[PDB]
Design a protein around this nucleic acid. Structure first.
Ligand SMILES: [K+]
Ligand SMILES: [K+]
Ligand SMILES: [Mg+2]
Ligand SMILES: [Mg+2]
Ligand SMILES: [Mg+2]
Ligand SMILES: [Mg+2]
Ligand SMILES: [Mg+2]
Ligand SMILES: [Mg+2]
Ligand SMILES: [Mg+2]
Ligand SMILES: [Mg+2]
Ligand SMILES: [Mg+2]
Ligand SMILES: [Mg+2]
Ligand SMILES: [Mg+2]
Ligand SMILES: [Mg+2]
Ligand SMILES: [Mg+2]
Ligand SMILES: [Mg+2]
Lengths: 179, 107, 46, 74, 56
RNA sequence: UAUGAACUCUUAGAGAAAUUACUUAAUAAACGAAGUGAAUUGAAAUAUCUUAUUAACUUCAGGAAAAGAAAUCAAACGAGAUUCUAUGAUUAGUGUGAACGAAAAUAGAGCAGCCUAUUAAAAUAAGUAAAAUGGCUUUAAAGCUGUUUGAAUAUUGUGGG
RNA sequence: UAGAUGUGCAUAGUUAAACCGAUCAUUAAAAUAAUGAAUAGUGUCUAAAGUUAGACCCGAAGCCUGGUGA
C-alpha cells in the first residue's frame, strides 16, 4: 500500500513484501538492510491474498450450490468480507492503510485499537496476524511509545531494565555522513 | 535390621511413583516434629494439591491441575498396586472417596 | 493420411522446442525430465 | 413480532475525554456508533475504548454505561 | 554459514513481550532447582506403608 | 585399518545440457500432510445417491511424515494418549432404492510419559465457546466453515460432552 | 504352582415388540373357545454352490483428469 510518512521516525511502514526501503535522502552504509524477523508460523500456503492484509483466520472456502427440488450439487466459493480501511495507530500517530476483514475490525474495537491488536502474544492472535500483521507488530515495537511501555511492564514483572535502537542507527549515519 | 529392607521396598517402587512422592511428600512421611507449612518443596509451593485446580493470585484465572483426571486415575491404580495409596493427596479418583460418595449420597 | 511435415525442418527449432533447456527452465518441463528419468531414458531431450 | 429477528450491533462502549458537545460530558460512558469512534474520535484522542481491563483500573462496573445526550451543551 | 543460520532463526527474540520474556526467564530458574531428593529417612517411612499394606 | 587420485553436464550467471565464462558455486523418483477435486461405473434409463474425502494436480516437509498423553469413551460397574492389523460388522444406523456404513469392546504388534516438556514452549488462553443463516461432514448430535451477532470462571457444582 | 484370559454357534419358544415363558401371540377384561408356532448340535475334510471382488475368456464407440504439439 501507499502508507503515510511517520511524523518523527525515519523508519517507514514496511512493505507487504517485507522490505523496508529507505529513501536515498537517508545516508546508509552500503550492504545494509532492515530485515524483519521471519513469521513464526510461516506464510499461508493457500489464499496468498491474506499474506498482505489483516484477514484473521478467514480464508476462501469451497462448497456446493444446492438446488431446491433435486438438490443438485455445484461447486462455489465463499469469500471473506475484505475491505480497505485506514486504521489509526496511536504509537505511530498516522493512518496505517491495509486490507482488513469486518470481523477483524470488530476485534480492533474490542482490544482497544490497532496497536493493542498487534501486540497480543496469545498463539491464536499471532496466527491471525499473518505475515503482514507481523510486520506492523515489528514496526510499532521500534516506536518510543511501545518501547517505554514494555520497559515499564518489565519493572512490574521483576525483570531487569533493558541494545542500540534501529532509529538511532539511522541517526548515526546522518552525523557520520557530515564528517 | 528391618530398616535396611524398608528403604529397599521404597526404592523398588516404579520411577513414576518415586518421582511424584519426591516432589509432593505427604506429612506422614515427613520427619516426626516437622511442620508441613514450612520447608515446602518447590513443587508444593506452586501447588499444594497438584490434582486440584488453583486460581492464580495475580491473574483471576484457574490453572488446570498438574495431573489430569486421566493421570490421576493412573497414579491411584499404580499406587494401589504397591500399597502406597495412603500417600497421595485428596483425589476424586480415590477408591475410598469414590465409594464414600456413593454410600453417603447414593444414586 | 500422413504428410511430409518434416520437410525443410531446421535443427534450430528442435533445440528451441524440444531441447534440454526448454524443460529445466519450466515447471511442466521438469516433469518430463523426471518422468523420462524415472523410466530410465538416456535421451531426456531432443 | 417473531421468535427470531435480524441480529444488530448496539455499538461500542467508550468514555469521553474532551467533553464532546451534543454527545456527553467529559468522562461519560455510553455506546456509540463504531464508525464515529473509529474514524473521528479515536484518531483525535477525543474518547477511548472501554475494554474489560479499563473497567477494573477505573474501578467502575459494566452497569455504569449511560446514553448519548443530544441536548448536551458546553 | 551455520552461525548465520542459527542466529537468524533466533532473531525473533527481540520481538518478545515482557510477559513472554518473564515466563522464559522462570524456566532457567526453575530448571536450575533440580528434582527434590528423597531422604533415606523418608524412604524408611515409605517402606513401612508398603509392608503394612502387603503382609501386615 | 588407513591412504594418493577421482574429469564434463544436471548444478554460478548466460545459452541451442555435457559449451561459454568462472569457481574450492552442488540433493531424482516413490512414500507424508494440507488445499483443490472429477468421470467412466452401478442403480438394469436417470437427476439425490453410488463411483469417491478415489484418481489427478498444487504447495510444504523429513528420513520417515502425520498423530498423540482426553473439554476421550462409558453407564450407575468402570476403562485410561497416538499409530498399525484382525474381530466386533453384509451390525446399530442412514437411504425411496441401488448401496453406503460406525463406535464401545476384545486379540495381537509396540508401549512412555510430560511442562524442569532432555532442548529449551503457558503468567492456563474472548471476537473464542455458541447462536441465526449459506454449505461440508453426518444419523438430527459432535466436528469443519463464509456471513451477521456474541458468553461464563472450577466438585463450595464454573464450562464442554 | 495357582487363578484368570481370548470372536462365535447351539442349548426354548413366542410376538411388530417387550413383559411373559413350555408356553406365547390376537380377542380394547380375563377365562383350553378357536387358530398358528416345539425336540442335537458343533468342528474339520472332499465336492458342488449363493454373495461381493476383474469373477469363464476376447471385443467397443465414447466420458473425465493431467500432460504434448503451430
Ligand atoms: K431405474
Ligand atoms: K439395517
Ligand atoms: Mg488470493
Ligand atoms: Mg491430418
Ligand atoms: Mg516450412
Ligand atoms: Mg448497524
Ligand atoms: Mg557450470
Ligand atoms: Mg546454470
Ligand atoms: Mg474396524
Ligand atoms: Mg483451559
Ligand atoms: Mg463455532
Ligand atoms: Mg447439545
Ligand atoms: Mg452441530
Ligand atoms: Mg463444542
Ligand atoms: Mg432365544
Ligand atoms: Mg510454420
Amino acid at each position: 500500500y501507499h502508507q503515510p510518512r511517520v511524523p518523527s521516525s525515519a523508519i517507514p511502514i514496511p512493505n507487504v513484501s517485507g522490505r523496508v526501503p529507505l529513501p536515498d535522502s537517508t545516508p546508509v552504509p552500503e550492504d545494509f538492510k532492515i530485515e524483519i524477523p521471519s513469521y513464526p508460523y510461516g506464510p499461508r500456503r493457500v489464499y496468498h491474498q491474506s499474506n498482505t492484509g489483516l484477514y484473521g483466520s478467514a480464508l476462501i472456502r469451497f462448497g456446493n450450490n444446492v438446488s431446491k427440488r433435486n438438490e443438485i450439487k455445484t461447486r462455489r466459493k465463499w469469500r471473506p468480507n475484505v475491505q480497505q480501511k485506514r486504521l489509526w495507530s496511536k504509537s505511530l500517530g498516522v493512518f496505517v492503510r491495509t486490507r482488513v476483514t469486518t470481523r477483524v475490525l470488530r476485534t480492533i474495537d474490542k482490544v482497544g485499537g490497532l496497536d493493542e491488536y498487534l501486540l497480543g502474544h496469545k498463539a491464536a492472535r499471532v496466527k491471525e496476524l499473518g505475515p503482514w500483521g507481523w510486520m506492523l507488530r515489528w514496526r510499532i515495537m521500534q516506536t518510543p511509545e511501545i518501547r517505554e511501555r514494555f520497559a515499564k511492564e518489565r519493572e512490574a514483572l521483576g525483570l531487569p531494565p533493558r541494545e542500540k535502537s534501529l532509529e538511532e542507527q539511522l541517526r548515526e549515519f546522518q552525523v557520520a555522513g557530515i564528517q | 535390621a528391618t530398616v535396611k529392607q524398608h528403604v529397599q521396598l521404597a526404592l523398588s517402587l516404579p520411577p513414576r511413583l518415586r518421582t511424584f512422592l519426591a516432589r509432593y511428600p505427604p506429612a506422614s512421611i515427613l520427619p516426626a516434629g516437622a511442620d508441613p507449612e514450612t520447608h515446602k518443596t518447590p513443587y508444593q509451593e506452586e501447588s499444594p494439591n497438584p490434582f486440584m485446580p488453583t486460581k492464580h493470585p495475580i491473574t483471576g484465572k484457574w490453572h488446570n491441575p498438574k495431573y489430569s483426571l486421566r493421570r490421576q486415575a493412573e497414579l491411584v491404580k499404580l499406587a494401589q498396586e504397591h500399597g502406597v495409596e495412603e500417600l497421595l493427596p485428596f483425589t476424586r479418583k480415590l477408591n475410598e472417596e469414590k465409594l464414600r460418595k456413593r454410600v453417603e449420597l447414593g444414586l | 493420411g500422413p504428410r511430409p511435415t518434416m520437410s525443410g525442418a531446421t535443427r534450430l527449432v528442435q533445440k528451441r522446442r524440444h531441447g534440454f533447456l526448454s524443460r529445466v527452465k519450466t515447471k511442466n518441463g521438469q516433469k518430463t525430465l523426471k518422468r523420462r528419468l524415472a523410466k530410465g531414458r538416456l535421451r531426456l531431450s531432443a | 413480532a417473531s421468535h427470531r429477528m435480524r441480529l444488530q450491533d448496539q455499538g461500542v462502549v467508550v468514555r469521553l475525554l474532551e467533553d464532546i458537545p451534543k454527545f456527553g460530558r467529559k468522562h461519560a460512558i455510553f455506546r456509540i456508533e463504531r464508525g464515529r469512534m473509529r474514524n473521528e474520535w479515536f484518531p483525535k484522542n477525543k474518547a477511548e475504548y472501554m475494554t474489560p481491563a479499563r473497567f477494573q483500573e477505573l474501578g467502575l462496573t459494566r452497569d455504569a454505561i449511560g446514553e448519548v445526550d443530544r441536548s448536551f451543551v458546553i | 554459514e551455520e552461525q548465520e543460520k542459527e542466529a537468524k532463526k533466533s532473531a525473533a527474540k527481540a520481538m518478545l513481550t515482557p510477559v513472554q520474556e518473564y515466563n522464559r526467564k522462570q524456566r532457567e530458574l526453575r530448571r536450575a532447582r533440580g528434582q527434590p531428593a528423597l531422604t533415606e529417612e523418608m524412604l524408611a517411612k515409605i517402606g513401612e506403608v508398603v509392608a503394612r499394606n502387603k503382609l501386615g
